[PDB]
Subunit: 670 residues, 3 copies
């Protein structure tokens, strides 16, 4: 009887052959699939394979693909590890001057409670990531409302973001505002600065500077007197020219032609421009961002609270001169039901849009392309009711490369019921779609990594991400959980992130190679003490020292405290108390309440031999509310020594007589 | 002359062939051993091999096995990195609701000084691990005695632990207490809550709840008025039913049958139940834990201080109703000499017990099985005097899979002398033993990873670990050191963990695959800023911000301090001082002692133009112990202004006259 | 037509064949080059290859070699991650008692501003690295001058370092000092302590102890009464014997022959010996260190500010007895032009020296060997004007193994122009040179890893490193950047490390195998919370607790503060203020300035029912500069109650009359 060899054609049932091979081979051998796809009836021990893809119909009629290690050149990274509920990169990520930005929202739930629009960044092509940065503060009217953002990008050297205001009670949208800020850049330029004689303003030529009046600009080596150091834009002449006010004037014209200098900009020292758009009608969420040209961009949106549902985009044709002017453009009505959160991108004059499907029992995600910024569209429906995921994407060559994630295990397929309130391992997929062929019937979703859905609450932070390309790599930034329960059902219904393990949702990045890497590897194993967030150095005396300024906003308990010399040429130690008032008080002692007091002293110890003392006694002291003032002089300056009330308290007592009173005149007795 | 090919049969001396192969092949080639075992006379360059095992008799007559990379599907992780002496997972680890728990002891030595019973946890199947948690405080009678624990596990949804009290002076056992606490769980249930009309108690049906009166329970969506929020157990009816006191009553009966709701529990908001067992006679250590059924469990023990030595277990048949009732069961007397620290597990009605051998020159570790919870036993001795290690284990299929570690390099073998006080690389091993065959003569110890023994002290933290299975992976949690000397012989005989590099012992976990993994990989590279222990966020002003409450118990030096608005609707800043009394004082200045003073001010600066001031002068000041009180009013409220002593001090002086005194009557002169 | 197979001979153009192979093979297949070198016209997708080297002439006539993964057994680690500008390991690294030391300089620029001579260490053969330690403080005359160091090593159990003083303004050398300190060691010894009867000194035999009078020594188990605990050296008899003063005397002679005891030493509790060498003439930098024997060592130097340039070494023949005595030795004059920063090592009586070339358009790096400590030399020039890099090295067998790094991409080659002010990926190389053959014409530079040069400033921290061997591994510790701009051109011209991402330069270590590894792997994945820098433990109450003493030197903002019991058997809470004076003040309130005040209280709350209060009112208060003193007693001790000025202020007022005054005699009215 003949056997029985694996065909790897995606159609022959290779289950038996692979089973035989696994049974016959040592467990530590890596079985090489030679880049082929093997149809099976159940997934085998995938860990024993390299360079293999499996095709499997968990649900009959719905083949999905599963990648062994090394089949794809890619790797998953964990990129945040914070106690906040960290999710929703959707759809905000971008690359700027070699830095990869993964914006997200850190909250305590699916909602805007405790929420800060945030980002982490990578300056090493995704190997390591920065300390989280808050981009927004809590709204001035917290806790009634707070901010929210799913649309962010860059246009002509400025960050643009749709900053939404929503209710904590219901996550209801109350306001839409466009916020923008110049991106920080160093520019190394030649020529372009002029300064007319006998007046103080200088004209700076910087093409597509993206700056507005009041924005920060720093200058070095200008060779134009007064154009130096930290400055601000005084006027904007046009898109390529601006002026600054210098502190001085010269008797001849100045012009730095041929001279090499440096500028200049700062996100952090420039204000946001905030353009109120009000409560944009028929909008549930603004989501995703597509830079169109030097002047503007599009943002996605959907309306999904009332009939009929809308899905489309808002095009801001000139966001520089006219931030408040946009045009609503919808996808074809056929594709709007059961759809939300479109991802949009613009390439080579084509605007591509992919929806999220809302139900696994109705037609789901669809793809659309337009050559007129959304006025007309060509469309396609992904098979099998793709749902619950956004599908962020990029175009690389002739392919859209899209990524998605089920929110919990076994929800991907059409007809698959939601399976929440239990821990699971949700599948993350990618697919390629060739734009010339324009047909998704034979789309191949390849599971490349599995996440965890914790199960302690119905909601999942898994997926809902964002995609960028940098050089020859594509990046999918997205949410995943771990098995640590947030205890929402339990002792932390309030959702305090700083109790127990806080919230399990954190960010991940799948880094996938999409073209040749013509350099030797940059990869390293991280072996350092992470020393950016709280920078610690063992001083010469052997004590951990933190030189960075820091804010501790949570309640602190301290032990022995020494306040060191710090202020006014280090002449003094200094504590400053804010608020309307400060209060320094004394707890009720647990063991000896009768001793309750604070001793204040001008010297080094509790003995009053060391300095003048004032001792405030607490109510619980045996000597209740006593004050003892103990110095070798008591000198009352600038004012009379008075009793608070009139004719109620005395100077001295029968057992506490003053020896006398030195007066400039007799007592005034009335 | 014919050569000379590697046989890989474990018996042919393959040394020459492998040497030839290594000499003839490029160093970067991975030489695949095809899953075979190669006998050699010395270990070759193992790093050049994949999927290879070597058999080597370092000591003639004692073959041991050595694994190349990929021979086993496994990986070592470092799981703690703390300055404490972190060791002794033995034998405490367990898995609960998808979380892997690695309890241990963090101290400053082999002893209970500075000791906290601790754990770290993993919520991602061992890829990353949590911030250490202290489970015990320092004993109330520290530093005479402190806690200790080598036995911990879960039975019917409660953590149970043998909390020992030992002397710091000698590590002598003084007390045994069983401590237990409900494990935190979220339950998603249907029906089961009833509340009789016209009274305030509700009955909650939760099978095997494991709760006691006073334990924490949280309810959501009960559809039973008053059964809501954070509550406590008022009564326990039976193992499956308990009641709570609600705050209200209704005129009809309530019953949430068919309704979906959520509960509820908390380790942290429930007290320990502590059951004093006294100084259990003839016990040196309680060690290891075997859950038997829904009602109870067994804990290991040995007595090794006086003849004759004992080794066995304590069976607690109903630890819920009767925590103080246990039965002592010993292994066969033949196996008690030179033995300690048994590891116990229960599977399919069989109790398995493995000892630690105490000497390499006498019969060592033995294995025992019982079908009657230790009343009768079948036994076997491991060959070659296995010693100095515990042998934690799990049963997977027909195999016990056990793990052990030499404490220092080259101590494993029978007759091998202890080799301490010098740095080395101790071998960690695993073995499989088939329970049907019941014969250890041909046991194969496979070295799968090497640790470091620092050598600065005689003692080693290497090994002494604990084993769990989760899904298709087995986990060995254990100690290892690094080369950083603790300076016990040197400048830190006191063993302060927070000097220099503290103590080199930290925890590791070997994660080994023991069945098929039928999912795509979950593996990630960690690229995040660790932001759980000290959560830092760069605020909108660019300053590192920590929102978590924190306690700093070590001495602190601070620079410039601002106390921000925090308290009473943020109306005030607040400092509260604990103790019997607080003391705020002033150091002797190093450069200008003549200036020694503190200026207290109601306003923003040292100029008294900014607010009222009181200045306390130190004894070293030129104006020694002066007090200057400087306000635009001095108002003395609620009491007479008196001198402390009688007829000793005056009002005013000849060069400091008050202009007059406003009185309601003439001075009373006596 | 025949094809077309890859020859892998380094001379046949294998470009076509490899292109064909890449086109025909699945992308996930690892293409094994079989350890061969393939000539190509452009670098292919190297990531698709294992065990392959490419030879490529980016610049015609200058072949360089490029390694795929696994061609070399090696790995890159990141070893620092600090906001300081962390660079210049050159040329300071060393191994001592199994610990690998990577000293460096952490500053804010190429200069001595904010500079601390620093190190990180590895106690696990380079897998993980310690919290940075500062070795130097800021110079007493900062900010005019500060310290600098490029030469450090160990000789007879002492650390020796050339500590330079340089100007912040220009990095001009002002002073050279030799600093040395005993290295911390634990010694486990037998015999050697004697103590003569009837007197208090004991003689300690410790060969090559390297200690001086006043150095720290700790003793355990001496069996010599009084030789115990923390002690200091009282006298040094010779290199192998020293005495200590014990606190007691005995009537007979004591001698611990045959007894096992422990000693003893401490870097941290021993002072530096500092030997001022003045401004050594004709020296720009002292760089690198070569231990010669038990008595001394050599340090490299160059002079490159004025003609003629010098390059050589300073030999300190007896640095123990005569730290101030050294001899200048130069390399052959032919090799001094365009050269700096020599790396020196001593092996088997041969002193090897390698220069840095300063220009890519003139003869560059050269290699020199001497058998007379630099009096005569044999020499060689590396081809192709090796420049901008130091070439630290070690000798392993017959080979020097050297490492170097271009500072920015495409600068390595002869004639290559500097390419700064733009981000790039600089190549790091190693080479082997056989000392018997003594010919570098055919040297093969192999690119083994690529770094990042950020481009925001002209300067680069890439490279300039140091090399050690430990066991069978060689380590190259060196600088690399990331893409985070320091904003020197932008908002941080001041170079504050603690703004934004600080400085991109951090340290890396390439760990390369150079001999057989005859042990099972020690490798682990790091999965722990890093808990050395800021050690955090979740206390039994669920709050993050830091038990280590810490210094926070940057400005702090605090929220609610509780100062816990800490001092004098925990009887009190304590705050101590340093400086000439302390100041506790109150900010101007933002919202209600009219309330500006601080309430000081002896009890727990703002209600004066809880304790005695003194309230200082600010100038902005409605009651400007009021003080209210509110207690149930006001007791003025130790001094008269006086007005500050004479006959200006009163006791009481017309609406604030004291009831009377209790006096021992009538008022003295004048």
């Amino acid at each position: 009887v003949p056997r029985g060899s694996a065909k790897g054609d995606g159609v022959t049932d290779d289950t038996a052959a692979l089973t035989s091979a696994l049974n016959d081979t040592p467990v530590g051998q890596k079985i090489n699939g030679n880049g082929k796809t093997y149809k099976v009836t159940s997934l085998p021990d995938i860990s024993r394979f390299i360079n293999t893809r499996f095709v499997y119909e968990r649900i009959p009629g719905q083949p999905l693909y599963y990648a062994s290690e090394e089949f794809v050149q890619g790797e998953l990274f964990k990129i945040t590890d914070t106690p906040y509920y960290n999710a929703w990169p959707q759809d905000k990520a971008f690359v700027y001057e070699n830095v990869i930005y993964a914006p997200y929202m850190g909250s305590d739930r699916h909602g805007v409670s405790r929420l800060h629009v945030s980002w982490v960044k990578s300056g090493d092509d995704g190997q390591t990531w920065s300390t989280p940065e808050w981009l927004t503060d809590l709204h001035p009217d917290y806790p009634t409302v707070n901010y929210h953002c799913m649309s962010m990008g860059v246009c002509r050297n400025r960050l643009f973001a749709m900053i939404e205001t929503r209710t904590l009670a219901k996550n209801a949208l109350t306001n839409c505002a466009l916020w923008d800020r110049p991106m920080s850049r160093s520019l190394h330029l030649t020529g372009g600065i002029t300064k007319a004689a006998n007046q103080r303003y200088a004209t700076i030529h910087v093409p597509d500077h993206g700056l507005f009046v009041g924005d920060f600009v720093n200058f070095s080596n200008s060779a134009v007197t007064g154009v130096s150091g930290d400055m601000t834009v005084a006027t904007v002449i046009d898109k390529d020219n601006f002026t600054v006010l210098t502190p001085n004037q010269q008797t001849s014209d100045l012009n730095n032609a041929g001279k090499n200098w440096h500028m200049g900009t700062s996100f952090h020292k420039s204000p946001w421009r905030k353009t109120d758009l009000g409560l944009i009608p028929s909008v549930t969420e603004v989501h995703s961002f597509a830079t169109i040209d030097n002047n503007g961009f599009a943002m996605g949106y959907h309306q999904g609270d009332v009939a009929p549902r809308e899905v489309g985009l808002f095009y801001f044709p000139d966001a520089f001169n006219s931030p408040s002017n946009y045009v609503r453009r919808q996808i074809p009505s056929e594709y709007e039901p059961d759809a939300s959160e479109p991802c949009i991108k613009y390439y080579d004059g084509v605007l591509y849009l992919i929806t999220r499907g809302t139900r696994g029992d109705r037609l789901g995600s669809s793809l659309h392309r337009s050559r007129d910024i959304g006025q007309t569209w060509e469309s396609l429906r992904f098979p099998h009711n793709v749902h619950h995921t956004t599908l962020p994407f990029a175009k690389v060559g002739d392919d859209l490369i899209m990524f998605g994630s089920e929110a919990a295990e076994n929800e991907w397929e059409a007809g698959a019921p939601d399976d929440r309130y239990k821990a699971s391992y949700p599948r993350t997929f990618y697919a390629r779609l060739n734009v010339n062929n324009w047909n998704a019937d034979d789309i191949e979703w390849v599971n490349i990594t599995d996440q965890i859905y914790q199960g302690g609450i119905v909601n999942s932070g898994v997926g809902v991400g964002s995609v960028v390309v940098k050089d020859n790599y594509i990046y999918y930034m997205f949410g995943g959980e771990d098995h640590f329960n947030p205890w929402t059902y339990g002792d932390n219904s309030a959702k305090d992130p700083f109790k127990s393990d806080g919230h399990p949702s954190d960010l991940y990045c799948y880094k996938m190679k999409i073209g040749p890497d013509n350099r030797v590897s940059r990869d390293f194993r991280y072996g350092a003490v992470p020393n950016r967030a709280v920078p610690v150095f063992f001083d010469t005396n052997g004590v951990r020292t933190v030189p960075a300024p820091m804010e501790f906003t949570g309640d602190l308990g301290l032990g022995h405290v020494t306040i060191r010399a710090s202020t006014s040429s280090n002449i003094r130690s200094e504590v400053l108390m804010e608020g309307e008032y400060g209060f320094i008080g004394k707890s009720i002692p647990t063991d000896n309440p009768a001793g309750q007091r604070i001793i204040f002293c001008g010297g080094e110890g509790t003995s009053s031999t060391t300095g003048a003392q004032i001792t405030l006694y607490g109510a619980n002291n045996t000597d209740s509310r006593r004050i003892v003032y103990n110095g070798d002089e008591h000198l009352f300056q600038s004012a009379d020594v008075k009793p608070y009330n009139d004719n109620v308290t005395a100077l001295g007592g029968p057992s506490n007589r003053f020896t006398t009173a030195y007066l400039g005149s007799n007592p005034i007795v009335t």
